[PDB]
Structures are given as structure tokens and as C-alpha cells.
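Subject: complex prediction, re-run

Hi both,

The earlier run crashed halfway through, so I resubmitted it with identical inputs.
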Amino acid sequence: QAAKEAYAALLLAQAFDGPEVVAGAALGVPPLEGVEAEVENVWGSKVPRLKATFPDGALLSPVGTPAYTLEASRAFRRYAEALIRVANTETRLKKIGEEIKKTTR
Amino acid sequence: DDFAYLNARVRVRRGTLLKESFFQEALDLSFADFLRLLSETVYGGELAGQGLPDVDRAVLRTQAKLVGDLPRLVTGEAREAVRLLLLRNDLHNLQALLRAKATGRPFEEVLLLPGTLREEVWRQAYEAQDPAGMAQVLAVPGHPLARALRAVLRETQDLARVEALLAKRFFEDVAKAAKGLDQPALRDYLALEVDAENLRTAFKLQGSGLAPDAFFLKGGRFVDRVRFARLMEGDYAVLDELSGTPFSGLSGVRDLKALERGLRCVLLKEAKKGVQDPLGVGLVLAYVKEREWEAVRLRLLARRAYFGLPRAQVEEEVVC
Amino acid sequence: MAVIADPETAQGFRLAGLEGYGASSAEEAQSLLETLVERGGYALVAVDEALLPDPERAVERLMRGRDLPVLLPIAGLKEAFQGHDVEGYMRELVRKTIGF
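This time it finished cleanly. Structure:
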């Protein structure tokens, strides 16, 4: 909710301050393995995991909208961080799938 | 020259400014009822679609014909005085334009409205293929923001740096010209704009380990290098010693959002009591802050209504 | 990356530090979703709960296995939403683990 807080409040004050916000901030996460993939052998077959941490900056874009710009930049963290939880459980889901099915089998 | 006709043209326009009691009504409305309300106003008069892209566009186009047409209607000594105000809205277009040429991205997704540089100046600049040529095309309307650009472009071709040194050099340029065009009303305001900029430069770059003297430029009222250095360490005890200025209200506040909210409300206030000085640039000064702030609240009230956000999240930011 | 979300909320994930290629183009964003994960030249692909694909089999059969995840739940809008706690808990219990 605190990610979106600023996002949704920077849409009709953005679409011409889109340019500004993306400039001061740390440039895009790599599309080829921007995330940190980890391999791990465990029962319930060899399932790979991963954690979503990458650079994106925070409270450091110069110029632009007084409050919103900086608050939107900071918000990128609340994607990253938050995403790690789902990053481990949805991969854990696929592991515990294997077990459950072989068990009842 | 002269503001005699021009002030008069603006006085009729101050009649169709949006009073406080509109935003009061609008919060109580859903998006469907908001849309019926909005259409009564002059921003409503440029409307072209119920959805969000269309609200952003109706607002912008209202600002393009009623506010961005002011520098053409005067010349000379009048025009330089009005121009400095307009220039901030032109810098926003310039920084985005400079960035579309440099990083190779399309013309689109930028701010365009007339002000001091016309639409065609931004198109001819875009299509220019040498940064130096890009710069002469910009220098055609004449303004201090060229002269500011020109010096920075001689030192560097790095995007982030041009952006910062242009802004710093530009407010410094503005200040000297403005002091030489006189009037007490403009001087008091100018001081606040620089003081607000100083505070704000310090906040945006907070904790980057940098020099605090780089965030202080002349034009001040009560702020200095030491307050900046403490502020940079993360200490907000400096704002709690800041009174005798209308930023007395920043005391005991330590959130970036409340702090920055505070500066925009203070600047609004100075300008709104410049109507006890309507002679010369005073009235226009008050007129531009109010059209800008009004436009901003209709965009926030429209966003708040569409996505069903919490009321208090926006009720506080739509009043000073 | 890409986040696959509503047009307006997709907007805020295209900002620098993050890389999004969202927007709705269907009710489960099939139009986009499929084409995009087919290459798997994005570090992460994520599908929200304002769309979420009712046939997950459709995707798996096209991407043909993936060592990177897909369809991570993000809310996809803000309206004070936090029903994505208990919803995800039951999403789990229905297809795997114990019943009710």
C-alpha cells in the first residue's frame, strides 16, 4: 500500500514528469538475471529459488515534483523487498507439490 | 511595453479562478459527480473525455491558452519581468527535451505548452543533430535560461550534471535580472523562491555525502551553510530554529513529505498577498501561482476519486 | 523484468530501478503474457491478482518449464486492499496440503 501511495498520486502530474523521475533515479534492473538466482538441492526434487534485491536507489532524484518524485523513487524498495517473500514461497510451492503428489501416489 | 492592458486582461481572468469552496465540494463527490462539476469551470471548457489521460490534457490546454500566452502580449522591459516567471515552466520542458535528444528516446512523453519558447522551437531543437545547433535554436526567443544553458553545455555533455548546473546557474541568473527590475512584491517572493529551492535541494540530495555549500545560493533570508550541513547529516533540529520566516511552520516536522508540502504552501501565501501591490508584475505573480495550484488540485481530486483512494490521504494536500 | 498489471498501475512499474512491461490487453492478460514469457528474456515475470490466469496450464505448456518464477501475486490496485493475505492462504490449501 505504501508503494502505491505515491505511484497513483503521480500519474496526471507525470506523463511529462515521467522523463524527470527516471533520470535521477538509478537506471533499470538488468533483464537477464537482474534478480539473484540460487540453486538448491532438496527433497521434493531440485527446485531453484531466488531473492529480489537489486539497486533502484532511494531519496536521491534531483529536480521535479517536490514530494512525489522522491517518494516514488523510495517506493521502488517496497517492490523489491516485498517481492522476496513471494519469491521464496511460490518456489517452495513447486517443491511441496512434488512431495504431496509422490506421497498420495 | 507595459502591463497596463495586460494586467487588465488578467483581472477579468481572475474572475474565473477556482475558489476554495469548489475543492471543498469536489471531495464529497464520486468520480461521476466530479466530472459534472469540472465541466462548469474553465478547465472543463477544454475537456475531451471522461478518463484520466483526458483530464491531464484538459488541464494542460487551459494553462496553454490562458497563462502560457502572456509573454507574447507584451514586449521589452514588461516582457523580461513576466518572462522570468514563465521560465520555470519552460525549464521543465527544456530538461525533458534535452533528455529526448541525448538518450535518443522519442519527442513524445514530454511536457509541451507555450511560454517563452514556442512549440516550433522545441520541434526544430528536437530535429537538430549537434548540441551546439540545438542551443542556437533555443537562444532565438531570448531569455536568461539560454545564457544559463550555454555556459553549462561548454563544460559538459553528461545528462545528470547539465540538469543540476543548469538549474543552479538558472536561478542565479534569474535573481540578478529580477533584482534589477525592482518592486518590493517581486523581491520578497524571489527571496522565498530561492530559500525554498535551498531547503529543497538539500532534501532531494539528502545523505549523498556531498558538500552542503552547494545547496545554498544567494537570495536568502535566514538560511546558511551550517543548517544545510546539519540537515545533510539527517538532523532536522535546524528547522526547529527556523522562525522569523514563514517556514516557522516547518518546526517540529521531520517527514520529507510534510516538509516539502510546507514550502509550496508558504510560496502560495506570499503571492496571494501581493494583490496589495497589483501594480506591475505583482498581480501576474499571484495569478500564475493560483492557476498552477488549482490545476494540481483538480488532478489530485480526479485521481483520488477514480481509484477510490483514502480521503484523508488527499484532503490535507488540497488545502494550505 | 516485466510486471503485468492494470494500465494505470502498470505505469508506475515502468520507472527506472524496476523494468515493467505491463498493461491489460485481456482479462487474464493472455495477449501479452504468453508472447513475453515465451522468450524468457526478462529476469522476472509477474502477473497480478487484478488479472491472474485462470488456466495456469496454458502458460506452462507454452513456456515449457522455467527455472525463474512466474505469476507472483501483486494486488494490482490500491483501495486499502489487504484481502491478499487470507486469499493466498486459501489458494494454497485448495490445490495442495490438507483440505478444510
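Residues 182-279 of chain B form a domain with the V-type ATP synthase subunit C fold fold (CATH 1.20.1690.10).

- K.
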